[PDB]
Each structure stands twice: as structure tokens, then as C-alpha cells.
């Protein structure tokens, strides 16, 4: 599989050289265009759900009685999707503005989680996504805010992006639904001058909840603390008092020492090696929309699969420059985009947008899941509407 494959030899390292030689160590790259070859053939809106790939530990942790045990949980899960990933260094591709993703899972418990995202803003880049398994009142909803940097010999994604979950059934002290804030680690490119490109996860991770919270971080690979892919984290409560540390290895083994029993030795946490990833299904290509990531890019993919990178950077090209000329006619028209399937929150919320359609907290799940497949087509055999079309804002004032 090309994901896997690094095609940074001479005349590609070059090319990136190149690049690297017009830009002053802190400025982004908003400015210019990556080369193919430094693809993986998914979308970051699909990129997305490869962190969605072990709900086991999501419905365990909603089922789990004890607060700091489901927190461990919740911790568990999150942590678990990172290790799903490339092996070679590549990057999903930025989507287009208004681009939409929609995916499902055929759980172990027969039951179903559903998967909606769409890019809802271009400069700057940023996507939401909503996950939801209503048959076990677990709510998700998140966005991706990546700000790209040059470093020098390094670059980045830096990750301003978050997450909140809801177990809907489990009420805190506000009779509100149970609710985890997380962040992400920022994603850095290292040796891009001298030697071998690799990817290390960077800095510090937040997961919080109304009764714990973690800080964990990525540890970058020294000099002196030479060793790759390490995390360091603590579980704590409100009051300082210290339950847990975690380390080990967010692609290999990590542990968790009971700080209470301070003779024990850390214990293993999450193997990535023993755990089996469930993947998302999708609606055949032939059902999908124009703007919808797998078809949209299928092209592009097509020829990065066969490493045709001159039909791959055309493909790119047209897409992208539709994209430019579209933006022009708005700015023309004096109007701006407005994203299909996400509000934009109010301010002092947790994250800039959410799925627009109103789904309570207490209503029956088969209602639930109903409407969540109004919002979109998401299960095979589903059609378009023109309301489909109709910017969310439109949306909620009918609603």
C-alpha cells in the first residue's frame, strides 16, 4: 500500500529542499503547495475516523460504574487510534471547502455508530465532525483546527482542534449528560534537512472531565532522552490528589501505575499490538456526491495508489484552482460560504461548530438515529435532497 511506501528519494527530497529554502523558520504554509508524493489517499476528513477505530473501549467506558475506572476507559479509547496511521511519512489531503465525509460502523453489539464531518472553513483551514451511537447514548463532537508551520529542520501541524463526548444517560451534578473535553497533540515533521523524515506526535494532550482530569505528554525524542514515541501523563483530580501515571508508548505498549500502591509496577494499559482495529464502512462510490471525499478526490487517489504523481498533481490542480475561482465568485457576490451540515456555535461553547440538527438528549434512540440520517446520506442506498444543499443556518431557522 503507497501509505506505507516512502517515495522521498533523491529528486523528491529535493523538491522539498527546494521549498524549504524560500521559507523563515516560524512563518506557515498556507502559502504553498506540498508535493503528491507526500500523500496518503484518504481525505483528513476520513483521516478523522481512524481515531474512531476501537469503540469497544468507548462502550465499555460507557457501561463502566466507577467515575475514575470510566474515565480510564475513555482514556483508553482515545488514546488507542493514533498508532492508525501511515507508515511512511504522508499527510491526508487538505479537503475543499464544503467537502463532507459520512461514514458507519457495524458494531460487536449489533448495534450502529454513524459519522458525519464536512470542511467548514478554508482560511483558515478547519473541519468538524459528529459521531454518535444513540443505542448506547454516546455523543461525539469535534474539530479539526490544524495551523501548518515550518521550523527549520522540522515542520508541524499544530493541533488547536478538540473533542467533546457525552454519555447521554449518565447525568453529572447539573442533570446535564456526562462530558470529556480532549485535545490533541500536535503532529511534527522532523528531519527535513539532514537524514530521514519521521513524524513525532509533540506536545501536550488534555482530557478533562467533571471529576478527573489528564495531562499528557508526548515526549519528543532527545538527544539525551533518545527514544521515540514516549508519553508522559498523570491522572488527577480537582484537588491536586494524583490517581494514576501513564507511560509506555502511544504505537506500542502503554502503562498505568496505581500512584497509591507506589510498590507496584506499572501495568499494561493498551497494547496496539494485541487490540484489532474495527474500520468504517461507506456507501459505494456510484451512491456519493460530487463533493464528497472519497469521489471527489478519486482521481487523485487513483494515480497516488499507482505512484503517477504528474496525473495525481493535475488532478490535484483542477480540483483546488475550482476551488480558488469558486472562493473569487463569493467575494464578487459579497457573500460568504456557509457550511451545509454544521451551526456555528455561539460564543464561550466548547468547539466552533456542531451538527445543525437538533437531536435531544432524552429522546427515544430509534428517533435519534432517524435523524441523523436526514441530516445526510449515510447508509447505502440512502439520496440526496436539495435540502442537503441549503446552508445549515437556513436549516435551523425552519427547525
Same mark, same amino acid.
Given at each position: 500500500d503507497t501509505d506505507d511506501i516512502?517515495?522521498?528519494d533523491e529528486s523528491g527530497h529535493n523538491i522539498i529542499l527546494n521549498i524549504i529554502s524560500q521559507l523563515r523558520p516560524?512563518?506557515?504554509?498556507?502559502?504553498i503547495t506540498l508535493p503528491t508524493?507526500?500523500?496518503?489517499?484518504?481525505s483528513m476528513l476520513e483521516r478523522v475516523t481512524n481515531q474512531l477505530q476501537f469503540p469497544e473501549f468507548l462502550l465499555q467506558a460507557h457501561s463502566e460504574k466507577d467515575p475514575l475506572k470510566r474515565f480510564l476507559y475513555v482514556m483508553k479509547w482515545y488514546l488507542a487510534?493514533?498508532?492508525?496511521?501511515?507508515?511512511? *511519512?504522508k499527510k491526508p489531503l487538505n479537503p475543499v471547502l464544503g467537502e463532507y465525509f459520512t461514514a458507519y460502523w457495524d458494531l460487536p453489539n449489533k448495534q450502529q455508530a454513524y459519522y458525519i464531518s464536512e470542511?467548514?472553513?478554508?482560511?483558515?483551514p478547519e473541519c468538524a465532525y459528529f459521531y454518535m451511537i444513540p443505542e448506547s447514548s454516546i455523543r461525539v463532537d469535534g474539530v479539526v483546527i490544524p495551523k501548518s508551520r515550518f521550523l527549520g529542520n522540522s515542520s508541524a501541524a499544530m493541533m488547536d482542534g478538540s473533542t467533546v463526548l457525552q454519555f447521554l444517560d449518565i447525568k453529572d451534578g447539573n442533570g446535564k449528560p456526562e462530558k470529556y473535553v480532549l485535545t490533541q497533540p500536535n503532529v511534527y515533521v522532523r528531519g527535513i534537512l539532514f537524514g530521514k523524515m519521521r513524524i513525532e506526535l509533540g506536545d501536550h494532550m488534555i482530557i478533562k472531565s467533571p471529576n478527573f482530569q489528564a495531562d499528557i505528554e508526548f515526549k519528543t525524542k532527545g538527544y *539525551?532522552?533518545?527514544?521515540?514515541?514516549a508519553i508522559e501523563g498523570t491522572v488527577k483530580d480537582y484537588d491536586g490528589n494524583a490517581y494514576y501515571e501513564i507511560s509506555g508508548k502511544w504505537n506500542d505498549v502503554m502503562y498505568l501505575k496505581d500512584l497509591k500502591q507506589p510498590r507496584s509496577s506499572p501495568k499494561v494499559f493498551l497494547d496496539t499490538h494485541k487490540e484489532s482495529p474495527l474500520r468504517p464502512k461507506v456507501r459505494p462510490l456510484s451512491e456519493?456526491?460530487?463533493?464528497?471525499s472519497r469521489k471527489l478526490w478519486k482521481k487523485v487517489t487513483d494515480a497516488l495508489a499507482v505512484r503517477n504523481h504528474p496525473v495525481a498533481t493535475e488532478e490535484k490542480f483542477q480540483i483546488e484552482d475550482h476551488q480558488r475561482q469558486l472562493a473569487k465568485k463569493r467575494i464578487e457576490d459579497g457573500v460568504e460560504f456557509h457550511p451545509k451540515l454544521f451551526r456555528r456555535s455561539k460564543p464561550?461553547?466548547?468547539?466552533d461548530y456542531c451538527i445543525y440538527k437538533n437531536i435531544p438528549v432524552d429522546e427515544d434512540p430509534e428517533k435519534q438515529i432517524r435523524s441523523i440520517l436526514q441530516?445526510?446520506?449515510?447508509?447505502?442506498?440512502q439520496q440526496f435532497t436539495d435540502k442537503f444543499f441549503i446552508p445549515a443556518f437556513e436549516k435551523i431557522k425552519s427547525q
Open positions: 516512502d517515495e522521498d516560524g512563518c506557515d504554509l498556507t502559502r508524493f507526500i500523500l496518503e489517499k484518504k487510534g493514533w498508532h492508525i496511521a501511515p507508515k511512511a *511519512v470542511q467548514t472553513s478554508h482560511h483558515p *539525551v532522552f533518545g527514544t521515540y514515541d456519493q456526491g460530487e463533493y464528497e464561550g461553547e466548547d468547539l441530516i445526510a446520506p449515510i447508509l447505502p442506498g
